[PDB]
Amino acid sequence: DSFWEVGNYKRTVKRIDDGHRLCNDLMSCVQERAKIEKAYAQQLTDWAKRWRQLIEKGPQYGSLERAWGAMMTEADKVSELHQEVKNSLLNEDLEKVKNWQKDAYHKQIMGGFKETKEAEDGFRKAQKPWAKKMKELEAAKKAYHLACKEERLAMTREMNSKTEQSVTPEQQKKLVDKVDKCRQDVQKTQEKYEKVLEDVGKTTPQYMEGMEQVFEQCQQFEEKRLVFLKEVLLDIKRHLNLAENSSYMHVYRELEQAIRGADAQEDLRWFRSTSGPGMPMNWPQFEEWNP
Amino acid sequence: TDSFWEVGNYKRTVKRIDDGHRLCNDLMSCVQERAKIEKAYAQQLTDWAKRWRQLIEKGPQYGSLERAWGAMMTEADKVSELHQEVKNSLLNEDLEKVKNWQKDAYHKQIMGGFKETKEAEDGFRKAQKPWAKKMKELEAAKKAYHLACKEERLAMTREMNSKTEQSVTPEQQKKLVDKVDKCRQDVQKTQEKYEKVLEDVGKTTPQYMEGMEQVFEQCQQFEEKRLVFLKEVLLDIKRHLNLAENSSYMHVYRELEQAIRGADAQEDLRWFRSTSGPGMPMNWPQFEEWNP
């Protein structure tokens, strides 16, 4: 199953098609993740809107009302941050992959791709003379062996031509003439087989150089891809990670400050003055007769 | 008036006792609904990781870039785990903390209301009862006095113009003169009485006031407990929601980055060369003799 056997360069060529398919998959992968980020964010938004309305119009009041209110703003801020992840995934990373793919893989009539075609033809071309020589080698080999077999038979007849009932002088001469015909053919076919072998030996460096050049062109093209995708994977790491800058942290700094700011006594004193003993009052006094 | 000190306007202080129980219910509903959102996100991350871990591990992406890309399914799973913790902490720690507190602070009586609400009702009601009675007396005395002045105007104005009249009999006049004598006397004792009830309202105002302040202060202290607790539970919730300062959240993305940075394009290229390329071994042709 060696690369060096006729045909087995295909594996390298399939890699070029696979590269394209891998870009698609990666784009689909980040798109689906963007979707998941958008869902989470919208649900945080809904909750925020829902509970900000229920807290406002509900009986909670004062600084504790606002403290509880502060939860809805963290949800909005966290929603916003996950919408930014979504935006980055789609607008930067996905697009970066989409565009690299466009400049790297050019479709033919009739696909698949020119890049796969080039490599195919390259490998075919580099291997054509070799392949032909290998067929000739195989023909010369069997030819040689068919001579070696026929000689062993012609000889095997000489063994039992000595001790067999009917053996005339005419055939005993023709039998010896036969083995010399075989021997001369074993030689003729051995020379041709040896000659093809020699040709195969002289051709081999060029066969190798040619294939190794096409292969290296494939290796280089794959490298552009592996280097690009590693960079894209870093882009995605950084866009997924909300700890990449301090905005995420500040969301919770602010939340905690709003909560700690809430004061029970302040709220109490407010209720006192607006609904309690702290309210002013017109105390009874003498009222004269009207009008 | 809307003033607290008017009879019955203490009711808003009482209503606020009922409101606190309802406020707890809202908080629990609020944290429940949040935990559902954390769960939903955590599950969707889990489904994405599972799906794409398979899609990758089903070829043709190989080598270290396969691992780097797969490390992304690991961050999805580990972040999912973190949002499940958030959910669990919200439900099992915070919601339970609130539910327990509600249970120990509020007690339902046989018909509808909370014991704590009925105690404030009765407390105010008791503290206001004498005053409520004096204000009815004060209203009644005020009516009587005004009605006595109105009756004085009828009798007095009826005398002023009956002086210059054609058929001025001496009785009345006389009985019309004696009708104002009565009305004047009605005004004196009715005004006296109104002045007396008004003196009494004044002198008892401080005792009415301090009695109401005592019952209100008990309400303040009960509300204060709700507010102090509520502030603490909100801090609890904040600590649980906060993944930003969480070291495991930080670690997830350091781990993802290390995986990606570990990817090695050349290593992957050598490997392909060795296992599929011109580095593969080869039995090159040689002279083969005849068999067997």
Curated annotation (Swiss-Prot), chain B:
It is found in: Cytoplasm; Cell projection; Synapse, Synaptosome; Cell projection, Ruffle membrane. Highly expressed in brain. Detected in hippocampus and dorsal root ganglion neurons. Detected in rod photoreceptor terminals in the outer plexiform layer of the retina (at protein level). In CNS neurons, high levels in the pyramidal cells of the hippocampus, Purkinje cells of the cerebellum and large neurons of the cortex and brain stem. GO terms for molecular function: cytoskeletal protein binding; identical protein binding; phospholipid binding. Keywords: Cell membrane, Cell projection, Coiled coil, Cytoplasm, Cytoplasmic vesicle, Endocytosis, Lipid-binding, Membrane, Phosphoprotein, SH3 domain, Synapse, Synaptosome. Changing K118E: Abolishes membrane tubulation. The keyword Secreted does not apply. Disruption phenotype: Mice are born at the expected Mendelian rate, but display a slightly reduced body weight and reduced fertility. Mice display increased synaptic vesicle diameter and impaired compensatory synaptic vesicle endocytosis after high synapse activity. Rod photoreceptor ribbon synapses display an abnormally high number of endosome-like structures and tubular elements after light exposure. Mice display defects in excitatory and inhibitory synaptic transmission in the hippocampus, and display a tendency to seizures when confronted with novelty. It is a peripheral membrane protein. Its main location: cytoplasm. GO terms for biological process: actin filament organization; negative regulation of endocytosis; neuron projection morphogenesis; plasma membrane tubulation; protein localization to membrane; signal transduction; synaptic vesicle endocytosis. The modification Phosphothreonine is found at T169. The modification Phosphoserine is found at S64. Residues 1-268 form the F-BAR domain. GO terms for cellular component: axon terminus; COPI-coated vesicle; cytoplasm; cytoplasmic vesicle membrane; cytosol; myelin sheath; photoreceptor ribbon synapse; presynaptic endocytic zone. Binds to membranes via its F-BAR domain and mediates membrane tubulation. Plays a role in the reorganization of the microtubule cytoskeleton via its interaction with MAPT; this decreases microtubule stability and inhibits MAPT-induced microtubule polymerization. Plays a role in cellular transport processes by recruiting DNM1, DNM2 and DNM3 to membranes. Plays a role in the reorganization of the actin cytoskeleton and in neuron morphogenesis via its interaction with COBL and WASL, and by recruiting COBL to the cell cortex. The F-BAR domain forms a coiled coil and mediates membrane-binding and membrane tubulation. In the autoinhibited conformation, interaction with the SH3 domain inhibits membrane tubulation mediated by the F-BAR domain. DNM1 binding abolishes autoinhibition. Homodimer. May form heterooligomers with other PACSINs. Interacts with both COBL and DBNL. Identified in a complex composed of COBL, PACSIN1 and WASL. Interacts with EHD3. Interacts (via SH3 domain) with SYNJ1 and WASL. Interacts (via SH3 domain) with DNM1; the interaction is reduced by DNM1 phosphorylation. Interacts with DNM2 and DNM3. Interacts with MAPT. Interacts with EHD1. Interacts with TRPV4. Belongs to the PACSIN family. This is Protein kinase C and casein kinase substrate in neurons protein 1. The chain holds residues 13 to 304 of 441 of the full protein.
